[model samples]
Target: KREEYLKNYLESYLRKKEVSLTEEEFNVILREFLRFAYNPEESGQEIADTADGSKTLIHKTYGEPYHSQTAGAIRESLYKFVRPSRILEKAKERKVIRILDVGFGLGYNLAVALKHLWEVNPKLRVEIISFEKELLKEFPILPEPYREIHEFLLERVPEYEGERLSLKVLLGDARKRIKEVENFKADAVFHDAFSPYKNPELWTLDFLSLIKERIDEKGYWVSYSSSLSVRKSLLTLGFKVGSSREIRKGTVASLKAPVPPMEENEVRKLVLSPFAVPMRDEKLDKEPLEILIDYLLKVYKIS
Candidate 1:
């Protein structure tokens, strides 16, 4: 029914322009249109309930949940991205806190950060610049307390300016959108993109160098990724990299020393092992497969 409706709409619209398309062309266009207008519910995507009783969705293409199944969506956002960020500690010293949220998936990280930061400093101002490739047309219902912020982010406003919080969600490739914020530095960067294996573009050394420039001297770069390659990239970029003490396996980095430093042996392994070779995307426009192949070639000295 919807396809027929769109076909008629397209025919009428094209008729007005005196343009025509062959049946094959029409079918191609229709297929692409439906794919672009994908609805999670209609697509039969499952909303999995996490171990902590929170909800998450699996990426149809990546074949991975948006959040850890065991840790739960909210719990992972709090411990892995929020608490380890130390945004509350920074809020105590500064009235305005800037956040560079790499993946605004479901807005869980931002919501959790806002709740804690505001509780610590009611008058605090937060400026968030987030990046996401695809914005969901609809989001899963968040549990109470977070429902309000979830609704706010769901509005999909180009820029949301509130009394104490301001947000700009840049929709596109982050490597390009990041250029829009010229000379901007974040107090904390939530590096919560999908896993490096699935999304190597975001984890490459060149893209990370761009992120490195946007971090304040005292700011923290936190990610659920404890991958040696990622940590090696951070260290090579001049960040004082460390593992999170709160979470079993997560990475935290800063221009200054991180709170709980990475174990000395771990650092040695990262530096000495061929497996720790950094992923590279010299032009910041390589396919994920190309990035992986290049890294492998270097690791095995085949390049």
Candidate 2:
């Protein structure tokens, strides 16, 4: 079963980081947090909780949850993406702020951003441009906690505007739809795609460059992944990448300046690692492995 594999994978993953999680704790967490059913008939929706007690959705097909196992969903969004990017801090000085949310899974990141941003300044003008590849065609009635987001998606309206907030969700492959945004410069970007292993196209050097073009001078891209490949991809684009938190290394990449600064040794290892090469998608339709293989062959001249 995929759950079995996930447990094994997570066990190995934790070992690699030298962390310990008891089987009892793990099992209890999964049972209590993860609904594990996607169908509305079986259960309204699937939600999984992280170590911190915050929730995230489990992908029906992939069987993986959206956020980090160490950091909860809302916590990751708030700490890794929002806090490091300094959107709220900057909002105090600026009137309007723009944010680009990649993947836009379940709208949790945006929801968290909005909840915090509004709290900081009730009338702080904000615009969010979200990109999603696919959405549930027939939205089911969600459980209490996520009802608002479920209704927003099911309603199928492209734009949502409040007194101080504007949200626009664009559907399609994010690679193609990203160019449609006009006069947009983002103060922060939430890179919450599946993984470099599963979704290399978005984590590629070229794609990072595309995103870099959109970010403001002081802005940064924040994500849960601390993959050497992800850091290499950003570094390849001349971005200053660094990890912010100890749990599930948080990353921030800047175009114009450095945020917290990646360590010299870590960056050296990143460039030297065999897996350090960035992915490519000249056609924007290649599979993750294909792009990874192409990168390996081209960069190292490997057979």
Candidate with top lDDT is 1
Once fitted onto the true fold, the runs of candidate 2 whose alpha carbons sit more than 4 angstroms away are 1-46, 137-157, 296-303
Report the lDDT tens digits of candidate 1 across residue range 1-303. Answer: 555654565455446646455666556554543433212223334688887787889886565788898888888888888988899888887889999999788788888888888889989999999999887766775787887867766674557898788899899999889877877799999998878866778998899999988999889999988888898888789988888754467888899846577788887888799869898999988766456545654665534
Give Cα distance to truth, residue 299, candidate 2, Å.
7.3
Clashing pairs in 2: none
Assess each prediction's global lDDT (C-alpha) against the native.
Answer: 0.78, 0.69
Report, for all candidates in order, the number of backbone clashes. Answer: 0, 0
Mark the regions of model 1 whose C-alpha exceeds 4 Å error after superposition.
1-45, 245-247
TM-score of each: 0.82, 0.76
Question: Per-residue lDDT for 1-303 in model 2, tens only?
Answer: 655544454445445646444566555434422232122112133666677665566665544677765676666777878888888888778889899989877676776676667678878988888888765454323343545654654454457787677888888888888878778889999988876655667888777777888888778889988888788878788888787885446788887856786677777888688767666787777655456435544444322
